[PDB]
Subunit: 334 residues, 3 copies
């Protein structure tokens, strides 16, 4: 086909955990979907202690924004590396075929930009990440990763082939950071990216993250930024981890339908308590809320969740169902 | 429904790896199933070296006992925290919906008790664990976790929808412990739970267990406490890990039918050598023994199994089948 | 049956990542397939730094060679431990039933040999490894593991039951090594296997590999030993990890059909980006190449891949498809 004959649509991305507007069932034929991302290297405070790192981001956030297209759309990404940055960057889409997912074609020095197009031939949620030759894990584990969702053109389906339609979608990007520690166990600090590199590699080689966070920081998806829903709403949570395994769990709920490894031609796993998203993968879980109140959404290595940062909240509005759960005798001495 | 119109049945739990009496196919309509558990904080020796920890238990054991109900039964748990204990505790059922799985409704100080009811709306094996706000992984990794099995009312089914019936069931709870170590690598000891807490958190944050055990101690499922079977028997092994991934394997056998993430509405995986149970999950594997002798049942990170403790035995009685395996030439010099 | 009435076929194995000649669909009835392996303890350089370890091998390689049979063939292995070796060895086949997978029947001192026969009753790819009582992880993590493929007699099938036929097959064995480190972080060296043992156990107990490699060394599957394919070829990659989880990923491609836990009676997972092979398992992924150029095949813990060694290359020949991917605007300043 002459791709120039296809419709074009532009999307300005939104900051995670929110997701740009889209339609589950495709309302048009195949399109070229145009996205622009601007790389930003920036300081970020990642914990309650005030630990500040030099993050490497797509569009200013950790994770980068969720892109949404349909199967056999074309993705056309304009990637900009402003001259205010220091490092070389590129992008690898796990959704794409060829050229190291695009990384071989998108190397941009500060002051440069590029435009890549690929055909989204497989439905699913997929990781994207920076991957400069020779320095790949340093960029990924500095926050330079996100995800793309390639919906089937007829939307999602259950294990029987019947439609599943979400009312709300959220994108939780989970980030392992490796802040270098000294003999005493104290975090070390660095003056330039080049002076940081060897100790960054040493810290990564421990295979022991210092922080594991959702949306870029301890507690980011809590408080005024808790996720929200109403009783009876159907919610899809897309979860990615570009480098390390995770095991999501909704405390007080389930994954009613889960694509743990994220690929929608497969039937979902039903009624999951907890599911394994391998490092380098995006997964998706669908749940219909049945009770109001606070939920915690966690990586169910509970050390990772409650000590290292991999925990967020939902605040759910609505009616309490005493058939489903009740306190028969409240805590008391007798 | 008026739950007061339903039958009630009481169960006194039994110590793992054994499981209280039940029927696979439900012989009654939906019931309220009454369980009582008494929390016991106690010293436990966890290894052959004599390392003694302060364990936190449901009903005196690590893991806590397996509860068995059927889909859409109600579980009514009386949870008792005697005044001989020191700490606050509660319970979160991954089988339940709402209130952090029950944890928000079951906080009991020493000297208190509570009764929780929930409807078991999803079939599967599920983790339960203590989860006091702000101290969750410390309680879980001190042994305060178990599992509940919610059987379909028509029992288990294979990948084709035909019945699978077990002759024996065992519950293997796998526990990661994090005994604090000093600079020399030596275990540290503590006088009160409060004096222990910070170094417990530091040890957990290494993400490196010091011990990984079945049924509470190195070698617990060996010797006079090896698991047993006969050739031709169908055995279900329920395996849980509340905090960390495991990968069970029957050395000399297989998982003929495996629900690795434990949820029975899904078809089982067939003929598994090894399967991944994510931390925060229970799984179940069904096997028909075909050869007698000693088997080892392990976490197949063999360091975890044979150095850190995650290994038990089966002793199987019966006929040897030389068609299936034989020594053609016994080890010899020639 | 009288096994003596069956055909016998002898196979001389080939060095990974190549695989001995075989037929996907069985061209004969059930056979006794005869294999011989000679154990070799040898020094191996495992990294670009020149780090040299004392490896324990089947047939001189890490991993050991891939054996290929069909379901309900018999495998007859002659295992030789020459008197030039120092240690006791044996073999455990995860494909086999009974006697700890054969390990109880195959213990050979230096100067001894043995012949084991077993029936390959379950289709799939499976790990085999040495497992001497009391020293199991030391042998496995010194390289003494490989895999066996038990093909269905009618070859591989997709999720719909239609045939899948590979044009090329490769075997990637992934090895975690634990070279002991001193206080300074420097590798330690040892004069005899007995003098090495305690520090080998200590290093293993860190659960932190020093090296994670394909085909026995950093960079082994690169350069003149890169894997190869042509555009349009169907390639099966069998991947094993006898001790530790891995998460394979083809950078620039996918797993079109993946048996992540390796057992062919199950339907494959479709369109995977990344898949989890649990430690103690072999998996298999099928892909049809669609673009030429260099691909990296990695464990997608990118630290494990690019810092610790778990990365190889494909070099793919053929036509570039600009519909699938193109550079619209090459990197430039504007
Ligand atoms: O970029 N990770 O959430
Ligand atoms: O800017 N280099 O492709
Ligand atoms: O039940 N979640 O910890
Ligand atoms: O140190 N982790 O939030
Ligand atoms: O939305 N329930 O009141
Ligand atoms: O909950 N009233 O005892
Ligand atoms: O409590 N864990 O076996
Ligand atoms: O004892 N407090 O719910
Ligand atoms: O074959 N189990 O180590
Ligand atoms: O030190 N583990 O049994
Ligand atoms: O139970 N077999 O003799
Ligand atoms: O096993 N007899 O040589
Ligand atoms: O032996 N492992 O590649
Ligand atoms: O050489 N011992 O079986
Ligand atoms: O996209 N692989 O790093
Ligand atoms: O130190 N690893 O190649
Ligand atoms: O094989 N493609 O030119
Ligand atoms: O790629 N030409 O601007
Ligand atoms: Cu970058
Ligand atoms: Cu990648
Ligand atoms: Cu507790
Ligand atoms: Cu939990
Ligand atoms: Cu050996
Ligand atoms: Cu094994």
């Amino acid at each position: 086909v002459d791709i120039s004959t296809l419709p074009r649509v532009k999307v300005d991305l939104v900051k995670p955990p929110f997701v740009h507007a889209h339609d589950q069932v495709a309302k048009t034929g195949p399109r070229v979907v145009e996205f622009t991302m601007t790389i930003e290297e920036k300081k970020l405070v990642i914990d309650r202690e005030g630990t500040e790192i030099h993050a490497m981001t797509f569009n200013g956030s950790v994770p980068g924004p969720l892109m949404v297209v349909h199967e056999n759309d074309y993705v056309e990404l304009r990637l900009i590396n402003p001259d205010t940055n220091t490092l070389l960057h590129n992008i690898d889409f796990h959704a794409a075929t060829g050229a190291l997912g695009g990384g071989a074609l998108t190397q941009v020095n500060p002051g440069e930009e590029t435009t890549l197009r690929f055909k989204a031939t497989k439905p699913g949620v997929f990781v994207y990440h920076c991957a400069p030759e020779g320095m790949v894990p340093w960029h990924v584990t500095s926050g330079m990763n996100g995800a793309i969702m390639v919906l089937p053109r007829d939307g999602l389906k259950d294990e029987k082939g019947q439609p599943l339609t979400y009312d709300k979608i959220y994108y939780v990007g989970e980030q392992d950071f490796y802040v270098p520690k000294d003999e005493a166990g104290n975090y070390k600090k660095y003056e330039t990216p080049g002076e940081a590199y060897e100790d960054a590699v040493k810290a990564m080689r421990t295979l022991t993250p210092t922080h594991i966070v959702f949306n870029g920081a301890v507690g980011a998806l809590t408080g005024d930024h808790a996720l929200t829903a109403a009783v009876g709403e159907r919610v899809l949570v897309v979860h990615s981890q570009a480098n390390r395994d995770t095991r999501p769990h909704l405390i007080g709920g389930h994954g009613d339908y889960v694509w743990a490894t994220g690929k929608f031609r497969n039937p979902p796993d039903l009624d999951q308590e907890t599911w394994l998203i391998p490092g380098g993968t995006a997964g998706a879980a669908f749940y219909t809320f049945r009770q109001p109140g606070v939920y915690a959404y966690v990586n169910h290595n509970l050390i990772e969740a409650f000590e290292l940062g991999a925990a967020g909240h939902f605040k759910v509005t609505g009616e309490w169902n005493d058939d489903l759960m009740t306190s028969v005798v409240k805590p008391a001495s007798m």
